[PDB]
């Protein structure tokens, strides 16, 4: 019954909308490539070179 | 009639206008884009492998019965539009006659539901 009542009032959809809006106004982790780059550790295996 | 000229002629005019806009958009690529068809390009898509057959075979429609009942319910609701528009002027018979009409509808709807006609074949 409690679960039936909450589904009638669309509570699961309301919670999703609220969660979506919390993400909506939150900072984005997106990098602004090519101006901003991902992190590389010293161990990173990239292009080969002869020293 | 004035009502026809003032209100319905614009619908006919805009029907042509919206049609012209849609047609011009199709012809834009037909005239500008490069056309280079070949047998592989124009073959049917089925995710990279050739289709087993085309789409001109019989196919069971598991909601066929609900679609038949859709036709019936469409006419039932149609009788409500003149009633709703005339609601202010309805007589006592005109009002309760609709209630009887809707009660007969609900008996039919309760019969469909109880029979199981709303579950797919």
């Amino acid at each position: 019954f409690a679960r039936a009542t909450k589904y009638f009032l669309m509570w699961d959809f309301i919670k999703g909308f609220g969660l979506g809006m919390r993400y909506f106004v939150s900072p984005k982790p997106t990098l602004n490539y090519p101006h901003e780059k991902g992190p590389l550790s010293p161990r990173f295996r990239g292009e080969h070179a002869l020293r | 009639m004035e009502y026809l000229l003032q209100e319905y002629l614009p619908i006919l005019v805009f029907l042509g206008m919206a049609s012209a806009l849609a047609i011009v958009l199709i012809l834009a690529a037909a005239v500008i884009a490069v056309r280079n068809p070949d047998p592989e390009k124009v073959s049917a898509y089925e995710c990279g492998f050739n289709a087993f057959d085309d789409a001109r075979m019989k196919f069971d429609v598991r909601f066929y019965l609900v679609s038949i009942l859709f036709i019936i319910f469409d006419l039932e609701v149609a009788f409500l539009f003149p009633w709703a528009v005339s609601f202010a002027s309805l007589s006592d018979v005109a009002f309760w006659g609709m209630m009887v009409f809707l009660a007969v509808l609900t008996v039919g709807f309760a019969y469909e539901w109880k029979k199981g006609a709303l579950e797919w074949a």
Binding site: - | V93, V107, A110, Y111
Partner: protein, 479 residues
């Protein structure tokens, strides 16, 4: 709607109320476990409604701005329809259960068909005629096709639906022309405008379209070809229904239309009705000779008998209508008796329908063959049977109207038709080598054979006021 309007249509509301309540009771309290109970409550309901229609004191009138006419004519027709419908259901109950055909919705569909028939015979308006006819027709298509595993039931429904819809379209097209000419759908308005000096081709076209549309429902030639296939394909209980109640309602409707809307142009429509009657009498008689299936034979029997009934209407008189009413009453009784026997026919526990199965049946079950003998001579119109007096009445109306040529043609076709009824008697009593057909009849089905068979002889002594009742009913219509 006034309280006087509602009182007038009360028998129809009672039937409609029962059909709705029965639908919910069947749906919610057992479905097919109530099928047998709903069938027998429907039989009681038909008889109760007939008592409301036919008993007590009645004063003729109209309701709903003349759209519904409650007169002696409509009351005569309703009673016969309801009692014939009750008889068909009662006699078929055991058969349908044994054959696993009794859905709890079958009684309800029949009840709504009868409801449509009740509005047909009381129509005082083109729209009332249409809505009553269509409620009946739609219910008849369904029961024609209700044996789902039978390809022949499916084809019977398909042929009936397509051709019934075509006839309905022709009826509507003529009804639209009549409305355009007269400016109204009410028959009292229509009759006043359709008169000798004002019959344009348009309004005469309307009458032809309406007449042809209706003449389909009584299987008048050449609007008959549906009948043999539909009679054969549909379940025998449903065939028995088609043969009795719809034909009575449809015949009364035609009389209602031609007298209450076209009553001042009798000369114009009488000739058309006569031509339909002639073609139906001869084709039904001639085509019946070539039948080996008993159900398909009854269709041609039905077509020929409707031709004779149309002879009474072609007279265009109160006596013609009176005798058409009596003819339809006697015809319905005869078909109830015959289809009671046809339902019983079976070999090795499966139903059988071929005529050769009747060979030497009189030496298997003497009383049933004797009943069948009286019915076949009654259908052939041979004295002393009540079937003869039915033909005598319509022939009397024809001669009375200066249409002896029609009466002469009618009796000649009767002679040709008498052959295939005589042949059934020949098979039963001195036919060829027997294949073991047995007649399985319960008490109710048994009485559905004997009582109509007795009525064919007892009715020869006294009609018990039915002939006098038909005369009063005809007067209210014709005036």
């Amino acid at each position: 709607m006034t309280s006087l309007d509602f009182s007038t249509i009360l028998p129809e509301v009672v039937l409609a109320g029962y059909a709705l309540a029965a639908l919910m009771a069947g749906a919610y309290l057992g479905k097919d476990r109530l099928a047998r109970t709903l069938l027998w409550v429907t039989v009681a309901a038909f008889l109760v409604v007939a008592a409301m229609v036919g008993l007590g004191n009645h004063v003729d009138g109209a309701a709903f701005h003349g759209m519904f006419i409650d007169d002696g004519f409509s009351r005569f027709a309703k009673v016969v329809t309801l009692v014939a419908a009750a008889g068909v259901l009662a006699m078929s109950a055991d058969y349908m259960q044994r054959r696993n055909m009794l859905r709890f919705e079958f009684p309800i569909i029949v009840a709504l068909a009868v409801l449509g028939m009740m509005f047909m015979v009381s129509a005082g308006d083109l729209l009332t005629l249409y809505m009553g006819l269509e409620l009946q027709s739609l219910a008849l298509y369904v029961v024609a096709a209700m044996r789902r595993d039978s390809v022949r039931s499916s084809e019977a429904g398909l042929k009936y639906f397509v051709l019934g819809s075509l006839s309905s379209g022709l009826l509507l097209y003529g009804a639209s022309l009549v409305y355009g000419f007269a400016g109204t759908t009410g028959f009292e308005g229509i009759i006043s405008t359709i008169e000798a000096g004002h019959l344009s081709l348009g309004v005469l076209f309307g009458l032809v379209f309406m007449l042809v549309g209706l003449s389909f429902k009584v299987s008048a030639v050449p609007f008959h070809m549906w009948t043999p296939d539909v009679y054969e394909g549909s379940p025998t209980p449903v065939t028995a229904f088609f043969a009795t109640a719809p034909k009575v309602a449809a015949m009364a409707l035609i009389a209602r239309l031609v007298f209450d809307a076209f009553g001042h142009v009798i000369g114009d429509w009488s000739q058309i009705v006569a031509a339909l009657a002639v073609m139906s009498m001869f084709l039904g008689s001639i085509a019946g000779i070539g039948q080996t299936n008993i159900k398909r034979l009854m269709a041609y029997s039905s077509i020929a008998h409707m031709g004779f009934a149309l002879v009474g209407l072609a007279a265009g008189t109160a006596i013609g209508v009176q005798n058409m009413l009596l003819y339809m009453t006697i015809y319905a009784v005869m078909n109830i008796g015959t289809f009671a026997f046809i339902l019983s026919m079976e070999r090795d526990g499966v139903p059988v329908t071929d005529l050769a199965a009747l060979n030497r049946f009189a030496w298997t079950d003497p009383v049933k063959a004797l009943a069948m003998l009286v019915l076949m001579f009654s259908l052939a119109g041979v004295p002393p049977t009540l079937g003869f007096f039915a033909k005598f009445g319509v022939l009397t109306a024809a001669v009375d109207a200066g249409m002896g040529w029609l009466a002469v043609l009618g009796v000649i076709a009767s002679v040709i038709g008498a052959f295939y009824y005589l042949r059934i008697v020949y098979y039963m009593y001195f036919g060829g080598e027997s294949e073991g057909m047995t007649s399985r009849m319960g008490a109710v089905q048994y009485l559905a054979l004997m009582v109509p068979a007795l009525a064919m002889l007892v009715g020869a002594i006294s009609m018990f006021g039915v002939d006098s009742a038909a005369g009063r009913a005809a007067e209210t219509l014709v005036g």
